[PDB]
Amino acid sequence: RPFIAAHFHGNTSGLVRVSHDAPHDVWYPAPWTVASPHPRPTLTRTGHVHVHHTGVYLVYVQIYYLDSHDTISWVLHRTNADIEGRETLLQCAQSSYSTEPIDKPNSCFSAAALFLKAGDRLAVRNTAGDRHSLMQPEKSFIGLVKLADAEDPTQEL
Amino acid sequence: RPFIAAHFHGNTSGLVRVSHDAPHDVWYPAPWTVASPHPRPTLTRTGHVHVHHTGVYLVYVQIYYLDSHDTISWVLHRTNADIEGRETLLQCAQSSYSTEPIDKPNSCFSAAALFLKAGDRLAVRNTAGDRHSLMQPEKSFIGLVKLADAEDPTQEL
Amino acid sequence: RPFIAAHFHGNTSGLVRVSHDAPHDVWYPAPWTVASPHPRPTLTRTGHVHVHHTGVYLVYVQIYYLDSHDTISWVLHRTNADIEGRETLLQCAQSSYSTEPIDKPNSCFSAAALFLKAGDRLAVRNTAGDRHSLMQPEKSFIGLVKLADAEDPTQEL
């Protein structure tokens, strides 16, 4: 049974400013992913995760913010040659009120079983412009594990 | 190998007020769950997840709050014809102090490998009365994936 | 197929003060883990999870803090006879500013697909001294599920 899976983590080879509408792109495959003998999702030079096999995947994302804004939030965007624009599959948010801009650490994690198609690209974007995150391997990452085969469950109208 | 798994996400077809002790009930199966050819957990009209196969499951829950209370928290309640009342399997909490009631977004995620019996019902309740959450598919959801067969690991005394 | 997996949860048989640099050690296997007929990770008397089989694991941790500090954070430490000191595999953080020390609940969850070797020990430590957490089964836990075989993906230089 092939292990169609990959883990990519932050690697600045760690504070990174992410501009409005830019995807997080300081990802790098973990060693077990680099060494994996299995067909698997891959990482593009733009920071997108490139899915090569259709199925239901467990997808998980963590962004570790070190930021002074009251609200930090990310979205997982899915693109594909067969759809116009982006689809938002997952969202995480953390928020607290402060009167002054104090930098503070907050990791925002989410995960779900998601249907993904061969040819999909996945990117993580912040929902609002200019947030700072720590791109260190234990702090920020995106990974996915194929759980089952599946036909496309949606059709056009 | 059957994929005994399901994902249900928020769908108001998105802000919902959840009354004290009421379960979150604006769930709907994701398309891959609707289309799944496999035996799987199902969703009742009360919002409970109905487990049909005994085993160890990965269970995950996210509630996306948009609320002005200082503390937001949910509990995962397990019921079954063979037990009196509810069992709390999982709990999530987020809290910060503010002097005035400012609405702010906070997603509360948790997951674990849990033993579930055929006939179990699972519901998510807030721990305190009247919190508002965003019931949109990318923001709030509950899913489970059977990982292994298992006999009942507890017995009565 | 063996289910090489275990779940350990907080059990004070629930507020616990964890001293600086001490590992969380009020863990206990969940009933399905106690009853599992499979080879699996085990729990040491020091609170470390003892890995017995090399592979890629889904590892997840939740610490439920009930604490008055502005920042709460934990790290997952990996040790092994073949490495000097500790490796940090995973980190979670939550932070908000308050002018006075008000106790408040915050669960800090993270998970990832991690390469683990037979003989590894895993411990959860707080990053800063003296935080209080609730060691109740639904609130705080550490679990892992082996997903695939894997050779050691790193070599010395």
Residue numbers in the entry:
A (entry chain A), B (entry chain A), C (entry chain A): 1 to 13, 27 to 170
Text taken from the publication that reported this structure:
Like other TNF members, Eiger is a type II transmembrane protein with a single membrane-spanning helix, an intracellular portion, and an ectodomain harbouring the name-giving TNFα domain. Two receptors of Eiger have been identified, termed Grindelwald and Wengen and which of these is utilized may be context and tissue specific.
In this study we report the structure of the TNF domain of Spodoptera frugiperda Eiger (SfEiger) at 1.7 Å. We concluded that our structure constitutes the soluble SfEiger TNF domain (part of the Eiger ectodomain) which has been released from Sf9 cells into the culture medium. The interface between the three monomers is dominated by hydrophobic interactions. SfEiger possesses an additional α-helix located between strands A′ and B which is absent in EDA (indicated by a black arrow). Finally, the surface of the SfEiger trimer is decorated with a remarkable number of histidines (30 in total).
